[PDB]
Design an enzyme around this catalytic site. Sequence first.
Site, PDB file in Angstrom:
ATOM      1  N   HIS A 166       0.891  -1.332   0.127  1.00 17.74           N
ATOM      2  CA  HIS A 166      -0.239  -0.011  -0.095  1.00 17.74           C
ATOM      3  C   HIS A 166       0.925   1.089   0.125  1.00 17.74           C
ATOM      4  O   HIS A 166       0.558   2.435   0.775  1.00 17.74           O
ATOM      5  CB  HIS A 166      -0.990  -0.148   1.122  1.00 17.74           C
ATOM      6  CG  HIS A 166      -2.102  -1.143   1.241  1.00 17.74           C
ATOM      7  ND1 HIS A 166      -3.258  -0.965   0.854  1.00 17.74           N
ATOM      8  CD2 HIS A 166      -1.962  -2.503   1.652  1.00 17.74           C
ATOM      9  CE1 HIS A 166      -4.045  -2.023   0.814  1.00 17.74           C
ATOM     10  NE2 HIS A 166      -3.168  -3.029   1.380  1.00 17.74           N
ATOM     11  N   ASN A 187     -10.094  -2.744   3.188  1.00 16.59           N
ATOM     12  CA  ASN A 187     -10.004  -2.556   1.713  1.00 16.59           C
ATOM     13  C   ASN A 187     -11.348  -2.865   1.185  1.00 16.59           C
ATOM     14  O   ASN A 187     -12.216  -2.588   2.051  1.00 16.59           O
ATOM     15  CB  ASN A 187      -9.311  -3.666   1.037  1.00 16.59           C
ATOM     16  CG  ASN A 187      -7.933  -4.378   1.495  1.00 16.59           C
ATOM     17  OD1 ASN A 187      -7.089  -3.866   1.465  1.00 16.59           O
ATOM     18  ND2 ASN A 187      -8.183  -5.561   1.248  1.00 16.59           N
ATOM     19  N   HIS A 189      -2.594   0.520  12.282  1.00 21.72           N
ATOM     20  CA  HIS A 189      -2.610  -0.817  12.648  1.00 21.72           C
ATOM     21  C   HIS A 189      -3.839  -1.300  13.273  1.00 21.72           C
ATOM     22  O   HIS A 189      -4.287  -0.645  14.061  1.00 21.72           O
ATOM     23  CB  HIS A 189      -1.201  -0.839  13.572  1.00 21.72           C
ATOM     24  CG  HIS A 189      -1.271  -2.221  14.255  1.00 21.72           C
ATOM     25  ND1 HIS A 189      -1.047  -2.861  15.581  1.00 21.72           N
ATOM     26  CD2 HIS A 189      -0.879  -3.764  13.791  1.00 21.72           C
ATOM     27  CE1 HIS A 189      -0.795  -3.965  15.612  1.00 21.72           C
ATOM     28  NE2 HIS A 189      -0.662  -4.649  14.503  1.00 21.72           N
TER      29      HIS A 189
END
Lengths: 83, 727, 309, 727
Positions: free
Chosen positions: B102, B175, B366
């Site tokens: 990414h 996503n 995260h």
Amino acid sequence: ISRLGGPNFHEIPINRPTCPYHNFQRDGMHRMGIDTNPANYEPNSINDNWPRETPPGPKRGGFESYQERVEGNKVRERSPSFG
Amino acid sequence: DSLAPEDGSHRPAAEPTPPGAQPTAPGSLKAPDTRNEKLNSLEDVRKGSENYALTTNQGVRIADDQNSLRAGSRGPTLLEDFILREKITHFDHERIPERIVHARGSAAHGYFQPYKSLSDITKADFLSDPNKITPVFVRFSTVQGGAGSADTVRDIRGFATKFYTEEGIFDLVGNNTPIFFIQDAHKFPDFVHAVKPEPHWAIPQGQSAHDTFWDYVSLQPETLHNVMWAMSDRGIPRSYRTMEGFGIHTFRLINAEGKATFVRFHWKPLAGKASLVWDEAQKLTGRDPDFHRRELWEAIEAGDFPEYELGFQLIPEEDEFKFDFDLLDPTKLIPEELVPVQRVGKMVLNRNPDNFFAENEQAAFHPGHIVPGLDFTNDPLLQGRLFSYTDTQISRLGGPNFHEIPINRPTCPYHNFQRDGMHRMGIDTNPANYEPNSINDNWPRETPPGPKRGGFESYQERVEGNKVRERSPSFGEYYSHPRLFWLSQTPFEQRHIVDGFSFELSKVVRPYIRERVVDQLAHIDLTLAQAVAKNLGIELTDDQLNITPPPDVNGLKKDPSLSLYAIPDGDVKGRVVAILLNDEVRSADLLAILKALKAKGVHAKLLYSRMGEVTADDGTVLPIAATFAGAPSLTVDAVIVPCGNIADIADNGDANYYLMEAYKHLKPIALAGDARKFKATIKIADQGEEGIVEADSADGSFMDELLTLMAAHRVWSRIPKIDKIPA
Amino acid sequence: DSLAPEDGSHRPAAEPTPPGAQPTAPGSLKAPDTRNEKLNSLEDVRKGSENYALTTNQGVRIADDQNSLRAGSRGPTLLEDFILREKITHFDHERIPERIVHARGSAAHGYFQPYKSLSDITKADFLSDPNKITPVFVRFSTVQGGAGSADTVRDIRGFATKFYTEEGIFDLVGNNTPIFFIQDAHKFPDFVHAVKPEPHWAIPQGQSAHDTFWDYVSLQPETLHNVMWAMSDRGIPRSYRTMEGFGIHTFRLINAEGKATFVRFHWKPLAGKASLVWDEAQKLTGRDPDFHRRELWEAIEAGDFPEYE
Amino acid sequence: DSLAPEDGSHRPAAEPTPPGAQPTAPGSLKAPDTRNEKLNSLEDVRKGSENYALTTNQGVRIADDQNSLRAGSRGPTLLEDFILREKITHFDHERIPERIVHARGSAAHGYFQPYKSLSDITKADFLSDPNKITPVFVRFSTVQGGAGSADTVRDIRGFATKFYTEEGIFDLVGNNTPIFFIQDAHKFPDFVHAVKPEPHWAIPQGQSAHDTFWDYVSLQPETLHNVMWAMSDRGIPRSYRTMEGFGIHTFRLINAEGKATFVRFHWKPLAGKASLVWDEAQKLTGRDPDFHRRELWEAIEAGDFPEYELGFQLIPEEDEFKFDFDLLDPTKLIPEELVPVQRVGKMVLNRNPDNFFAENEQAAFHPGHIVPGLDFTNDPLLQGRLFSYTDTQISRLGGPNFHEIPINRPTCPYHNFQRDGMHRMGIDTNPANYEPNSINDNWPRETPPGPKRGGFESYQERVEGNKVRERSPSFGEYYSHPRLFWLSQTPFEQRHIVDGFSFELSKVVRPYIRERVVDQLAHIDLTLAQAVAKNLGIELTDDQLNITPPPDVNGLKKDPSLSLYAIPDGDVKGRVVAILLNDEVRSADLLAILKALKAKGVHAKLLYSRMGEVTADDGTVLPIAATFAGAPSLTVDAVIVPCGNIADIADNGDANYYLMEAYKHLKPIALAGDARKFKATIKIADQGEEGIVEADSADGSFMDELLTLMAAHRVWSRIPKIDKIPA
Ligand code: HEM
Ligand code: HEM
Ligand code: HEM
């Protein structure tokens, strides 16, 4: 990763295996090995899956963990036997 | 001094302007008054400029910033020029490591707000009161290419949200498709190595159309559901505003009484779902590699803020084994027909950064950044991810104090006994840096778990089994969910999937790999298999013709939620139209056109063969925004050609191709008066056809037919015609 | 095992093949017998694969490389899986910083050899005997875009040569036009900041067609000679094989008697000079962003070696 | 909770207390009201503790901080314990690289203030008005040992001052002797390699008594002047408060009319000069390796602030070649007899840090950090240093943004067009990051040079010569300045130099190296040569006996400014006395003693064989500070033994040795009443002797004799006696 600058500390000469090590780990700071393998992932057909996994055995086999039984709940707790 | 033009024209208006009307700016300068709690707290590190002296980093003002210190004006540079060596040392060290995946990515600021209290299901404070709004920072990304790669590639896009909550940072890192490619985190390096540029020569960039990718897919049938999604139009979105987002794992919501609920997170795009078509998407990475970065920056400057609905799929703990797929399998989706998405709140992105590196490049997201009220499950891909995103920051962001980098700081308090490490910003006055301690009377102290403001305690799930490196048999099925996805597609959607596979596979040099991928497709659906096979010159074996299709998913035969176009929803607002000018444009046409568009919220680009301005027939002056070659059809949604002196652009190859490209890419074309001459270019029956709006003058109904086609995004009915066109 | 197709088709022929006739390979595997002194000395760090067991970096062979260690096959992953944590730690740390300029770039191995002794003008050993061949490593590059940017952009290209000589490394780091944009090194950060993506939003990539670039050109008339070159067809080459190279500064050649000569270095392309036209060059960054990287790799595999004077 | 003792005793009093009376604290907590402009600006990064919840760095409160997450209380730890992995990751990465030289070091906060305006000689704003006080940060250091090495080693000490001025940071980075060892910066790596631990086995630590050091000295006669200083008592100071500081290079002061003056900088210790003796200094690195760090922290907590005078040696540009040594030679000192030190201002150190790592370990000092009004010269060691201290920060402090680490930030503005780099804190809102620019109208702008607030412009010195790597012939003299230093020493000072060389040289294993160093000494002075030679069993060759001595330095035969003890100056304030208690101490003696000491500002330690408290003869309770073995004589300045039940400590080996060590280290010993029994221990004539104060009772005159000896520091007259003592 900070003391020795990175994921390739095993290539610093005192730390190198005197026996073979081959796998599909690539790149990272002061990468010494130039990998000629056409693949850097497994499973692969293009280098016919080398380097390959080895089954566990009496001599020269793969690492397999001892199958200890685990039962209990997810707890952050000290065993009373340690008291 | 001068250098600035007086008339003031170097500075943009600090108010919403349309796309390309002004130079773009820093957020603070374009929108001084969009504030929120995270935006206001960054104020302590913002640096201005005006009326300030140029200095070294040590505060010494510079008199000559054009020359080095030399012994005579044609002599050698001296080692004692400390001003030169500081300026070139900081230059020499500008770049940090990019994200190992990414790396591309575009971010904006905004907020979240709940529709109602969800206290019955989670004790998570950010979801406890509809009146509590939460600062977010969001970064949209691709997966394969480096940060210098193009935006409109065929790939999965990421969607990461940082929630600055009163009880900690909650990062929801997801996503734009609902399943991942891999079941277990141990294989993540092999899969990313196979998609990535090949090791010997580092080709290709931003593409999976290469041998190693498709080698690992053919040898790993669990990757096949998500490869179907990437091969669909779902892999080339029109905008980050026009896509869905998904957390992909099953997580837990824990309420104040201790009850755990499984949940899957969704983001529903309030502008509708829409994608590019591949020739368009591919040519556009050449014509504008920053198209997705650009258009997000500009939607927010025009005030067309992105908005999304947070939505939950809740499943009671008792129904854990009610489906015929394992809920902890990340390659399985939960059909909305079986479990509905409940809309929980809304997110609005309404402010761009001031500094891309500082805010965007240094942001760390995260999934292990959860708060009280949430917890994890045993999903094998979620468990591994948890290790990774703390680890990677030690080199990307130089060390264990990345949370002190200003974009990443909690807006709520954090105190603990962690000391030292590189570019430690906090000076700790605590006499103790260990607990238990009596010398600072044990502060800061541990907090018990409770309904509001309590400590983090994990859900006490029962674990029994042996230490085994072994995959659960419940994960062993690779084919009914790709066929459910396939059967839920409109016919032209399925065409586009056939063509996605056929293009990619034509780029594998080794033919046994392509055959191996067609065999796998024949286990999903034979029609799919036969279509791809044909484009490749491959014949299916009678045995391949006799493979039995996979079972249904809990008796479901299709779910239309999995299609982009089947149930329509469409923003016409914030879309963009190109208007092809000539030197005597009929203003009657033009003021009608622009009024109509303005009422609907659609942006126009007045385009010509030269820059500067032309004059309408009534002497109105029209400033030209781009040339025909400068802003191709690729970058708009529809083309309108008003009447006037048509003879001027009629013979122009660029103006004619502008229409043929647009035609082929299935966009609405509107021709007023003599502009209808160009029908002869794109080969239309005098009798007309759908998707070509034509009339004697641009007026109300002409514009209505056009905006209606526009709400429907592309003219899918033209797909049989476009094969004979050479464009 | 299988995974490989027998008929042998997964491996390329170790001999010159045309463009796209075979899968491309590592140098050693495609051309086992092109050797030189630098190529042979890297032999001590080349690692093979075939017939070798998969191991950790510490030499311990792996039996299951598909699964993490969990307490039961649907249970949690255990912190004592050292095999999983080593594999994901090295992944987490793959990337080093990219070149702050010239980050894109493509390289190849080869040699240099003098036509005659230049001992009359320089006491430089690599130029002392026509019979002395020198190992080189060459990297061609663009200037603006990151390493993930496209190859056929309009820009200046770099041309850097590492000469592994008997008396030290001589690096001749030049570009493909004969003048630079700036007179003094103190301005280099301001010029590179102005060409580069703009600070607020990081657009554009691989392009100077943006306000700040042209702002600094209009305020700095010394940049105008080299902007003319970049604006010509010279800014979009057909191949790294079809361009000239230049050291741009005046240097000195010092002979054994102490006499100094000023010199400017040139590289003359033995394949001729040729460039793309802009609509072509721009559309091609969409259609194949790796066109220049690809075609250099493949000229060398077909044996159409690049040569320069 | 508890853990804290109520009675409040875990917290120190926020007011000046004597040495060891309280636990020491963070600066803010011990001295809440010592403020200054740099101290107040660090307020934005200070973190408190009390009444705060323990959290992760992401703000999530911790309920159990004692246990890891395991599947059952005797089971394995789970990879999903994100609380454990964050806590151990920051631990794993605590340490940054240490200073490659001067790694040991101790720092404090304070200010500078000028005596008058020096506008006639320099346009430097920090020296322009006697009413302008400037924040400083000062770090004292050693040179060889790592940060874990001992404080009282024989070595050169560093003295670095950061001046937070209104026109930039001025760092004056000097040491405590006025010349360096090397002429040219190119040799700095070879010299530091030779002093440092040897490469094969890394021995010794904090010592030059090893072969390679003395190998490079014998082969490099320019090192000999500064080796003489290190071999003197000057190499073992009593305190950082009791030493001189020096900038060592010739610099330039530039006034507003452009006139340049050469200058050398001095720091004069307002507490006097005083050093330890070697047996003392060496044993004390075993007994307390932190003695210098400790005593600085505690002088400042007792309010015995360190103070120094900034002093200039000014030389007009015309006198550049008036001396018979080159002014640009760093191994040559300018005798104060030839050029006087003019006192310019005063510096006071009055506040300790809150966090040693944050404030002290992350501080970057560099000599190239000059301001307008100052400039450099062509000194070859100064020119090289200039390269170095920018470079070293890129790894020590992780990158080009070390100036953003809070101790290092200008308190004045700094704006420029430097962008990015690791842990970039400033978010730049400027639309431009290059100049010249029109889009932000060229801000921030260059400033012309002027009298006040102007840009930096270098002094236009003329340069003519060829590009040569060659040493100036004016640097070629290696021996008159070491002999001037030698001749200016008192006799016992010179003894101590003989003994410094003899000890060090006895530790060289290779004898040819020792002979080579004695040959060099015979070129300086034969008495020196013969003395050292004798201790080593070496004979001088009749040719060595006939070496002609070096010339005078501009006819100067000695300068007494170069001696530590010749012209006396002595703080008795802030010194420390040990009082040896017994179980029935006579309070008459004790209250007289302590009153006397308190009037002079001297600190007492009441010492016994046991901790707890004894009771004076009148029933007063006296708390014991240390045992005799716990706080050895090594750590005080004088010993007083009052009368009382002497029989108690008389037979105690520790109490008797306490006196023999102190005797030998030339300290004042005072014996009241029956305490005079111990004369028999240290072998004194009943008739008495100097430096032993004795009497029937501790009283006014007894204390006067003692404080008078104390102002004279050691009893030098005892040096003949101390050789027969076994201690
Ligand atoms: C459901 C599957 C996954 C999803 C939805 C996901 C999503 C993402 C997203 C959106 C980002 C971009 C962060 C940004 O914008 O700054 C990211 C970064 C990253 N992911 Fe994943 N990921 C998945 C699986 C994995 C796995 C299995 C691993 C590791 C074992 C992994 C390792 C990482 C790392 C190391 C980064 C870069 C981290 C960083 O820069 O902070 N991901 N992922
Ligand atoms: C005649 C003008 C110049 C030419 C011909 C030139 C050429 C090049 C080339 C070909 C490279 C690419 C290296 C590679 O392929 O790995 C490069 C890298 C670089 N250049 Fe320049 N350059 C010029 C001026 C400058 C100036 C004025 C500076 C600095 C003050 C500069 C700083 C650098 C740096 C820092 C790099 C990256 C260095 C590295 O990665 O090793 N260049 N330059
Ligand atoms: C007159 C001679 C010199 C004096 C008075 C001097 C003084 C000092 C002092 C006091 C420090 C300690 C900094 C601190 O406390 O943080 C220091 C550090 C240092 N010195 Fe020197 N030095 C001298 C010569 C040299 C030379 C010739 C070089 C390099 C060519 C050098 C390189 C350094 C470096 C690299 C450091 C560590 C720098 C840092 O940590 O910022 N020094 N010096």
